[PDB]
Amino acid sequence: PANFCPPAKVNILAQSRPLSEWPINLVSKGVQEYVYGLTAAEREANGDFGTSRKSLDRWFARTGVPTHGYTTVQGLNLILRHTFNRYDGVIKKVETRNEKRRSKATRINVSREADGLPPIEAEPEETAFGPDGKLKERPGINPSIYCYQQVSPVPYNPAKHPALPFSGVDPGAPLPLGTPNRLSIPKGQPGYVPEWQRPHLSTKNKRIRKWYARANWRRKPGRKSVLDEAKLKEAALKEAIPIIVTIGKDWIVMDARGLLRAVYWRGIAKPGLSLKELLGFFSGDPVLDPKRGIATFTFKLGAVAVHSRKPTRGKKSKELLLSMTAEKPHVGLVAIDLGQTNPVAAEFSRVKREGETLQAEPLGQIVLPDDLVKDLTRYRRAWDATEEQIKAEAIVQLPEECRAEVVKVNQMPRLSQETRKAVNDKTWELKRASTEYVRLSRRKTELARRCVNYIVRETKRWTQCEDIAIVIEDWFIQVLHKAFSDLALHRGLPVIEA
RNA sequence: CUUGCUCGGUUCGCCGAGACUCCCCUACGUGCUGCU
DNA sequence: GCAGCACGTAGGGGAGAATTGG
DNA sequence: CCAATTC
């Protein structure tokens, strides 16, 4: 039973007015501001919002949060239930911490009592509420508009929707395509392929990029072109696929080509499908991001065919392998010991079902290709280059009393175990706001996933088995282990540890 | 495989290769050693 | 258990749709 | 046609 719904993001093309000014956003912000300030006793009093119209009306009347004109039951149930669950979230954190601590105390003290030692004094368990009645760690306001059934996206129709300069496709008509006859574009026209790179054109299933894509015109050291943005923007808008969400009086228009590519690269749909089916492949409750301009869709329960299991280990591993050998009698394991030198070392095997025990059959080993290692080396160069800059910038912004001590640390004694905390905090703050650091941190994840995908692809070729299993042991060590453990969560492939 | 993102080559006319589980929010923690 | 190192980690909350009633 | 109930 498939139970995983990966996201798919689309771009906002136009708005009636900025998303932060909508009544839904205002009522969400007001509710979030009000609820978090409630004390421990006040939550029980103001915890009867109810899933009905009368209950919601009396909740808004009893308190003083302005409804801001937004009075929709489907949508206020999402705002209130999420907001009160965040209030219980901070309580649940300290509750589970104290539960683990009390289990430790119960084990240790009962063991000592069995040994005759009296139990130690009970520790002052932490409370989530501050001095008078307020939460110490007050939850922050969550900026997001959670769409619902009554405002589900629909294909654009100029008749019943506000007029915008770009056109709108027919919901029932088959969706358009790129340019198949790419080699037939005459010289001097957009998309023209010169007569020197025609032979070494890819034959594989590459994703087709249109000539106005930003990837073909962005600024890199080798690109001696011009990045005129207006021309690319209008050329891209001329061929958009608009879908619209109307919440009350406001509306928003999205570009649906993101959904098209999401269903295309996953292979769930083939070229030649309508917009109605394309929207039917996704949930009718997207999420709007006011800060970026991205609406995030998630696939329906059934669109993807993965199970999203857990990395079982220990005793359950043998039973998992036995059950899988009860399925098609060819299981190809791979061992991912992150050994010396190369970041990845693999060792394929095959096991049968010999009654009760397994019969492993070795099949050899493989190392990472040289191009991938070159890419990893270049990434590490870039990461170290940005690290040597951000650390220096953090050191510069330290207070003079701490700055002198840190300078002495650089100079050549190792002391001052009170400014290490300040250095750590300043470094975390700088890292959280450095855009280049975010880009290089996403690059690490992308490269790690590239390595895992390569290993999975090669482990299906050597063993010639469709179903595979992964064995791991507990720089790139942590990131690669995380990327390999995500396969159970994301793609459903079992991930055994040791 | 039409948008968006990342890395490269160029004759600058665009084509070679990738990831696709993502968001907010609050805390200062996590592993590796040296001695008790 | 209690210091020195590097490096980000940990843990709360999210991410619908059939029906049906005026 | 569109909110409101329900699980």
HEC string of A160-204? CCCCCCCCCCCCCCECCCCCCCHHHCCCCCCCCCCCCCCCCCCCC
Rounded to whole angstroms, the distance from the CA of residue A362 to the C1' of nucleotide C4 is 45
Q: From which experimental method does this structure derive? A: cryo-EM
Q: What is the CA radius of gyration of chain A?
A: 29
A255 DSSP β-pair partners: A11, A242
Nearest residue to nucleotide B6 when comparing alpha carbons to its C1'?
A443
Joined together, the tokens standing for residue A341 give 């030198």
Strand C nucleotides within 7 Å of a protein CB: 3-5, 7-9, 11-19
Number of residues that make up chain A: 498
- If 0-12 CB within 10 Å is exposed, 13-18 middle and 19+ buried, where does residue A244 land? buried
Residues A252 and A19 sit within 8 Å (Cβ to Cβ) = yes
Q: What angle do CA A312, A318, A322 make, to 5 degrees?
A: 115
- Strand D atom within 7 Å of A233 CB: no
Rounded to whole angstroms, the distance from the CA of residue A82 to the C1' of nucleotide C3 is 44
- Strand D atom within 7 Å of A149 CB: yes
Sign of the dihedral defined by the CA atoms of residues A119, A120, A125, A131, in that order:
positive
Distances (CA, A) of A453 to A5, A78, A204, A207, A368: 20, 37, 17, 18, 12
Could you tell me which of A15, A19, A284 has the C-alpha nearest to residue A149? A284
Breaks (C-N over 2.5 A) in chain A follow: 412, 474
Contacts of residue A154, defined as CB under 8 A and 6 or more positions apart, other chains included, come to A171, A243, A244, A245, A279
- Strand C atom within 7 Å of A302 CB: no
State the DSSP H helix or E strand holding residue A482, giving kind and residue range, or none if neither.
helix A477-490
- Strand D atom within 7 Å of A157 CB: no
Residue recorded with tokens 């499908």: A273
Q: One-letter amino acid identity for A183?
A: L
Rounded to whole angstroms, the distance from the CA of residue A498 to the C1' of nucleotide C6 is 26
d(CA A443, CA A380): 10
Characterize the bridge pairing of strands A294-298 and A331-335.
unpaired
Joined together, the tokens standing for residue A147 give 């769409």
Ramachandran assignment for A80, one of left (phi > 0), alpha (psi -120 to 50 degrees), beta (any other): alpha
Nearest residue to nucleotide C16 when comparing alpha carbons to its C1'?
A285
Could you tell me which of A267, A268, A273, A248 has the C-alpha nearest to residue A256? A273
* Phi, psi at A469, each rounded to 5°: -130, 150
Joined together, the tokens standing for residue A392 give 């220096």
Nearest residue to nucleotide D4 when comparing alpha carbons to its C1'?
A73
Tally: H helices and E strands in chain A: 13, 12
* Phi, psi at A351, each rounded to 5°: -130, 145
- Strand C atom within 7 Å of A203 CB: no
Ramachandran assignment for A280, one of left (phi > 0), alpha (psi -120 to 50 degrees), beta (any other): alpha
Sign of the dihedral defined by the CA atoms of residues A205, A207, A211, A216, in that order:
negative
- Strand C atom within 7 Å of A100 CB: no
Rounded to whole angstroms, the distance from the CA of residue A150 to the C1' of nucleotide C19 is 14
Given in angstroms, what resolution was this structure solved at?
A: 3.1
Could you tell me which of A323, A366, A336 has the C-alpha nearest to residue A458? A366
Judged by C1' against the alpha carbon of A160, the nearest nucleotide is: D1
Residues A344 and A367 sit within 8 Å (Cβ to Cβ) = yes
d(CA A411, CA A407): 6
Residues A303 and A268 sit within 8 Å (Cβ to Cβ) = yes
Which residues of A spanning 44-63 put their CB closer than 7 angstroms to strand D? 51-54
Rounded to whole angstroms, the distance from the CA of residue A313 to the C1' of nucleotide C10 is 23
Rounded to whole angstroms, the distance from the CA of residue A170 to the C1' of nucleotide B19 is 32
- Strand C atom within 7 Å of A92 CB: yes
Strand D nucleotides within 7 Å of a protein CB: 2-7
Rounded to whole angstroms, the distance from the CA of residue A482 to the C1' of nucleotide C10 is 15
d(CA A344, CA A381): 19
Residues A468 and A456 sit within 8 Å (Cβ to Cβ) = yes
Judged by C1' against the alpha carbon of A487, the nearest nucleotide is: B21
Rounded to whole angstroms, the distance from the CA of residue A82 to the C1' of nucleotide B8 is 45
Q: Is A265 helix (H, G, I), strand (E, B) or coil?
A: helix
Sheet order of strands, A468-472 included? A360-367, A345-351, A331-335, A468-472, A495-497
CA A258 from centroid of its chain's CA atoms:
16
Distances (CA, A) of A197 to A68, A179, A186, A219: 60, 18, 15, 22
Which residues of A spanning 338-397 put their CB closer than 7 angstroms to strand C? 387
CA A135 from centroid of its chain's CA atoms:
29
- Strand D atom within 7 Å of A150 CB: yes
Q: One-letter amino acid identity for A207?
A: R
Q: What is the DSSP letter of A299?
A: B
Q: What angle do CA A310, A139, A46 make, to 5 degrees?
A: 105
Could you tell me which of A342, A294, A325, A318 has the C-alpha nearest to residue A145? A294
Residues A437 and A386 sit within 8 Å (Cβ to Cβ) = yes
Residue recorded with tokens 């909508």: A22
Judged by C1' against the alpha carbon of A6, the nearest nucleotide is: B21
Characterize the bridge pairing of strands A468-472 and A345-351.
unpaired
Could you tell me which of A256, A298, A265, A295 has the C-alpha nearest to residue A281? A298
- Strand C atom within 7 Å of A287 CB: yes
Distances (CA, A) of A376 to A371, A373, A431, A444: 9, 5, 21, 9
Residues A86 and A80 sit within 8 Å (Cβ to Cβ) = no
Characterize the bridge pairing of strands A468-472 and A495-497.
parallel
Residues A297 and A10 sit within 8 Å (Cβ to Cβ) = yes
Rounded to 10 degrees, the C-alpha dihedral A454/A459/A464/A465 comes to -110
Judged by C1' against the alpha carbon of A74, the nearest nucleotide is: D4
